[PDB]
Each structure stands twice: as structure tokens, then as C-alpha cells.
Amino acid sequence: GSSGSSGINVRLKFLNDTEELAVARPEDTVGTLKSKYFPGQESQMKLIYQGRLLQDPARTLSSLNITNNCVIHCHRSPPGAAVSGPSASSGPSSG
């Protein structure tokens, strides 16, 4: 069995009139949250808190006044890049 519910819960609201359950901490960073829920699509998935852009991937949730039972507006931007490449393998790991 497992257990351990700690931290504040945040609701991710999208312009698509939808929402997503995401738990964030007052210490975590915006950049991490985006990659945590929106992997890769972090350059597009923009967050807005109180009319303010959380662009800063370092801006802590605590500083942004991001508390629990709160909602964060998400924004999607158009693909302004033409990057293309196969799966790359770099970074070994030996434990």
C-alpha cells in the first residue's frame, strides 16, 4: 500500500473551457509544473495568475501567491518552429 498527500492542489484551466487536476507546492517552480503536467509543451502552455504571466520558469508558486484550491489560466501558442529530429540517446546511468 501507498500514502502521502501533502501540498496544495491547483486547478489548471484551459481556454478550451476545460480544467485539469494538478497538485502544486508553494516551493515548486513554474517551469517544473509545466513540464510536470505539460511535458515538452511548456513553450506553449503559458500560465497566468491574476492577469500576470508566470513566464518565469523559476518564479516560485509561493511568490506568485499561488495557494491551494486555486485555478491557473493556461494559454496555447502557435508552433513557430520547424524543428525535426529522431529520438536521441544521450546521458548514461549506472547505479
Side-chain angles (χ1 to χ4, degrees), residues 14 23 25 29 31 36-37 45 47 60 65 67-68 74 86:
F14 308 64
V23 66
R25 297 203 271 198
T29 49
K36 207 268 268 300
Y37 305 116
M45 280 40 265
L47 319 182
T60 33
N65 309 92
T67 48
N68 89 288
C74 292

Side-chain angles (χ1 to χ4, degrees), residues 20 24 26 33-35 39-40 50-51 53 61 66 71 74 81 91:
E20 175 86 65
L33 200 77
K34 293 152 87 197
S35 186
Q50 289 189 358
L53 199 60
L61 323 209
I66 286 157
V71 83
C74 292

Side-chain angles (χ1 to χ4, degrees), residues 8 10 24 26 49 54 60-68 70 72:
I8 56 184
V10 195
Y49 185 91
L54 322 187
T60 33
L61 323 209
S62 162
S63 290
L64 295 176
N65 309 92
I66 286 157
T67 48
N68 89 288
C70 205
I72 297 189

